[PDB]
Amino acid sequence: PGRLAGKIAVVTGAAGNLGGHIVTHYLAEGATVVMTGRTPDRTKAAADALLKSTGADPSRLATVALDGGDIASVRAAIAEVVQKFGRIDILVNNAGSAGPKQPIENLPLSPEELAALQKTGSTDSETVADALRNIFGVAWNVARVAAPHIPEGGSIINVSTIFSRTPYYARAAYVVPKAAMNAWSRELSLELGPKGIRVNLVYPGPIESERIRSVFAAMDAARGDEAGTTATQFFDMMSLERATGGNEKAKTFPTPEDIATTCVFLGSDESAAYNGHDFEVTHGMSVRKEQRSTYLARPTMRSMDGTGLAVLIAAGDDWEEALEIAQVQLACGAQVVLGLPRAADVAIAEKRCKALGLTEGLSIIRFSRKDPAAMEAALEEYTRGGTPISGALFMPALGAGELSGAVTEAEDNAVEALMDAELAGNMALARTMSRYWKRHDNLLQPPRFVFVSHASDGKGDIYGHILRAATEQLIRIWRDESEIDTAHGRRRQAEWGNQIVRFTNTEAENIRFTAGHAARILLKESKLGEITLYVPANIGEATGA
Amino acid sequence: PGRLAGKIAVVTGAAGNLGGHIVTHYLAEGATVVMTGRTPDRTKAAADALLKSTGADPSRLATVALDGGDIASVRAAIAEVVQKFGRIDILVNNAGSAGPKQPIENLPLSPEELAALQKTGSTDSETVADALRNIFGVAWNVARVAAPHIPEGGSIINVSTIFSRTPYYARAAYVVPKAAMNAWSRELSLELGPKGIRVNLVYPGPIESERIRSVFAAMDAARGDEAGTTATQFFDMMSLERATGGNEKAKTFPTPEDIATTCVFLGSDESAAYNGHDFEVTHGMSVRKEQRSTYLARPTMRSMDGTGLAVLIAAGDDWEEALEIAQVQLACGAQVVLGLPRAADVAIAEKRCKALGLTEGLSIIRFSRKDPAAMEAALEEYTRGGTPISGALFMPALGAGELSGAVTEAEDNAVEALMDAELAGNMALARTMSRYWKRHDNLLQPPRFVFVSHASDGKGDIYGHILRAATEQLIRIWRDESEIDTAHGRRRQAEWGNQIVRFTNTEAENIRFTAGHAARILLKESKLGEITLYVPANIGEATGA
Numbered sequence A, B: 001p002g003r004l005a006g007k008i009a010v011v012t013g014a015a016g017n018l019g020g021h022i023v024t025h026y027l028a029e030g031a032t033v034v035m036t037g038r039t040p041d042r043t044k045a046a047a048d049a050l051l052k053s054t055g056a057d058p059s060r061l062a063t064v065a066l067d068g069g070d071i072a073s074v075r076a077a078i079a080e081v082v083q084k085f086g087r088i089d090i091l092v093n094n095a096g097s098a099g100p101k102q103p104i105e106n107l108p109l110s111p112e113e114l115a116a117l118q119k120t121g122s123t124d125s126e127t128v129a130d131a132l133r134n135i136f137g138v139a140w141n142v143a144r145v146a147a148p149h150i151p152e153g154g155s156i157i158n159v160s161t162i163f164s165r166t167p168y169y170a171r172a173a174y175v176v177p178k179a180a181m182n183a184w185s186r187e188l189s190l191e192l193g194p195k196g197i198r199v200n201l202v203y204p205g206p207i208e209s210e211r212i213r214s215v216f217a218a219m220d221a222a223r224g225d226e227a228g229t230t231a232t233q234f235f236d237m238m239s240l241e242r243a244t245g246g247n248e249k250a251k252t253f254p255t256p257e258d259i260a261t262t263c264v265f266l267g268s269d270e271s272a273a274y275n276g277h278d279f280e281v282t283h284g285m286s287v288r289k290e291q292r293s294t295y296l297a298r299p300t301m302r303s304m305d306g307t308g309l310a311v312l313i314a315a316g317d318d319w320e321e322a323l324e325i326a327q328v329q330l331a332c333g334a335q336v337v338l339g340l341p342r343a344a345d346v347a348i349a350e351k352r353c354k355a356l357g358l359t360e361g362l363s364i365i366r367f368s369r370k371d372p373a374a375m376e377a378a379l380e381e382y383t384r385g386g387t388p389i390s391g392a393l394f395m396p397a398l399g400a401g402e403l404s405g406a407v408t409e410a411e412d413n414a415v416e417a418l419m420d421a422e423l424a425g426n427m428a429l430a431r432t433m434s435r436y437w438k439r440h441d442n443l444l445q446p447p448r449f450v451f452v453s454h455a456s457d458g459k460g461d462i463y464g465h466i467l468r469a470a471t472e473q474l475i476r477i478w479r480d481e482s483e484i485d486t487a488h489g490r491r492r493q494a495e496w497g498n499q500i501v502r503f504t505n506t507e508a509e510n511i512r513f514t515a516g517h518a519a520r521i522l523l524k525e526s527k528l529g530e531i532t533l534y535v536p537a538n539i540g541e542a543t544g545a
Ligand SMILES: NC(=O)c1ccc[n+]([C@@H]2O[C@H](COP(=O)([O-])OP(=O)(O)OC[C@H]3O[C@@H](n4cnc5c(N)ncnc54)[C@H](OP(=O)(O)O)[C@@H]3O)[C@@H](O)[C@H]2O)c1
Pocket: A012, A013, A014, A015, A016, A017, A018, A019, A036, A037, A038, A039, A042, A043, A066, A067, A068, A093, A094, A095, A096, A097, A133, A134, A135, A138, A159, A160, A161, A162, A163, A178, A203, A204, A205, A206, A207
């Protein structure tokens, strides 16, 4: 019998290379497979050439037209799969796109910015939001449209990449939407676990092919690095050596067959004991799950810390919050630019700022991560006062509790709203501050960013986790890209920064703590190795005071 | 064809529940199995059972005698296996024994103590030392002997427990060695992986029996919680429910077959890519890898922080090291008991302390950790002096660098010495202080303990790493035992404490920085959530100063 005998399997991106190995292994294990592709012609071709190359019955292989980001197509596609076969025993979220292969400073956000990248003979065919919908959106959508038709003891397999947890210069667009999916897979496990549906996460390492060693050598050319630096990086993370392809034992890449044989194992009932589990098909590449630390001291700061420096604060709906952080920054003797998304809120706050009497060193302006063109202008304008922004604290876009609900249950707004405001806003802020610290590259101290999470929404911070994950990667890419550009002469000053997680603490005194430490990262001459830095549960206890 | 076709396996403790299951699946997938165990009569009876129950050719199975605590025994055993079949493809380190089932406070160290338990109708058969050798010794010795005869593409599998990273009540001698074994496997992952010998790590959850479901009713009785609390503890961690035993879907324990099927897979070439990997067959249990964080803060202290308080410092080989840590306490106004193993050191140190000018608040006494009856006696003499001991600080037993060499290429005595000195010293100091703080539950400040790592060996810190992950799980057991003893009104004062990792940083102040965070943890009113606290690489950078 076949380890997958009498099981309906759905494989997103079945036309691609791993796709077809998974389908091959599945048909040869006794599954009925439905192959999902954006195009019915390229997907049907990929289907028929698989029929040729295996010896399986036309009846045991099906295809269908699905595009994540178009939920109208994902419902119409699953439907056709339910009518046709009556259930989904195995989901394999393998669907994903390369993403714009540009550094953080040159990511195309608008369609005209992308058209403008096609005029420089580039191969990039995506916006950052296209890449999100294409990498992160498919998994989220397909999963939620499929979960109610997935019977007890069924399996979901979400195909990440090892590159989500490692530096991948000029690929901010590809990794952060994977890094998100990472936390989402875990959260989907927590919602579909009690229902008896397994959720498990495959991290394929760099995949062995003919192209790969040249694709890397090509990336090596990108950064002005001696060809082979990309490959050697990853080889040097690998602990395991192996003979593949009848070559000798060396540092090599894992195979498409290794990935397939895992998706056979994970799909099969042999794996029915595993949930929210990570499978790292990477030759034991040494990486950490979360490059983090919790704060074990009160942020002890002085009143001359910031003399000559100006912070930007990109605030969200809760401007009131932002201003509290602003306040402690001013208290350290730095200038502040509280950048609020509505102009409505620039009135209310500028006046309520006169009420408290914070007129010295603080300037409130409209600053809208939705529209970056103006975000650029606004920083040009502010610096004409002759002090340049030396550090940039970024708050979440949407008000706390704005995003809420089970990942499958959450509305068509939930994902699209989360993907656009939360992921694009972070990338736009990163591109915008990168572009600005390109121009004004002689600051008193090297430039420093800090991202900030919401406090605990107290519904289990489902969206707090996803965004911590995606942000943690965006910081790794940004730390790396700037450290490689700096060493090659292209910048004078290396951008560095951190992320502070508030949601591990529900105490009343948390914001002045969060904002306290925010100041230590920006204004003091520091480098914090760990990316994401958590606020302890109790602060009184965790520190001296 | 067999999924393990043409693979010589070696499964240690193959007579036990899982052992039978691993051999049964292995024979089905065409494996040639060598069963293993200290009792030949046992081993062979088992073999006969498995030869009937599975239609397996009696050629395709064999037995061999080996006690893991006894390396000679082990060298012989593999020698026959080698002689017979020529090589080892797969080595399953299933061998382990449930330790003494005794709470830290009542751990049996010397044979006489174990005999005092057996006249009590307790099922304890094992000293702490014995449990070490029975869980940790075996895995180390079987593997290191098997390695040479393992060809490339080879599989080592190490079977440990999830409970090695989660609290287990009065099961210190089970989980501590299981913890060392996790960190051992890691090192063996790295040392062999370059030879293409993959070394992965299975974490069984609670495994479905009739016995274990009552052993939780058993445990439940020892703490004094309602029966099914322990069941509901671990159930409450698991994200997955499942329909096992023909009972309707509910949170249920994983079957032995789930553990058996994984080895089939981990043994097989389908897993050619995975190395250093952890497989948790625990129904998606929610435990983190390690509860830890780096110090993003210089130790800030004050000159009265500890007046009226008293601190024990259990010293190892190198006492001058401990005496500088001791100066830092005294400086903070605490009193110091300096415990030195070798009675000769007492009068040597005594001079240095007058020469050095330290004469007030400091007492020096012989404090051998191989003599608890003496330890427990000396502490009572200091208490009679008039100040109870509020703070313990445990130094490593052996001199610096004395344990070295990659686990495989380790001297026969290096593993023996590491297990006895390091593991028993930590377990003994733990018992002795629990027993002392049971006797003195009315201290001015909660009682606080501090485990301090060696400084770097500058070689990878092989022993650094194993000894840390082990201590981390001793503390997690220590904290939870005092939490539950305090809640049920057995003890007024919650014991709590931390581990300080030093080997991460090489800087010249290194001793001062750790000696200073020891004083905080000891003499300040704080309860740090993270167990293991690392010194950061650069103290200049992490902390503004
Ligand atoms: N190969 C690697 O270097 C590597 C390394 C690590 C991880 N991975 C992961 O493996 C997956 C891809 O595997 P692969 O190497 O064989 O590449 P691939 O599958 O060729 O990737 C492109 C394919 O995915 C499908 N796809 C992409 N975006 C989609 C969307 N929004 N909606 C529907 N279908 C979509 C496309 O199908 P249609 O054209 O028919 O729509 C296309 O054939 C990705 O999820 C990736 O993160 C790959």
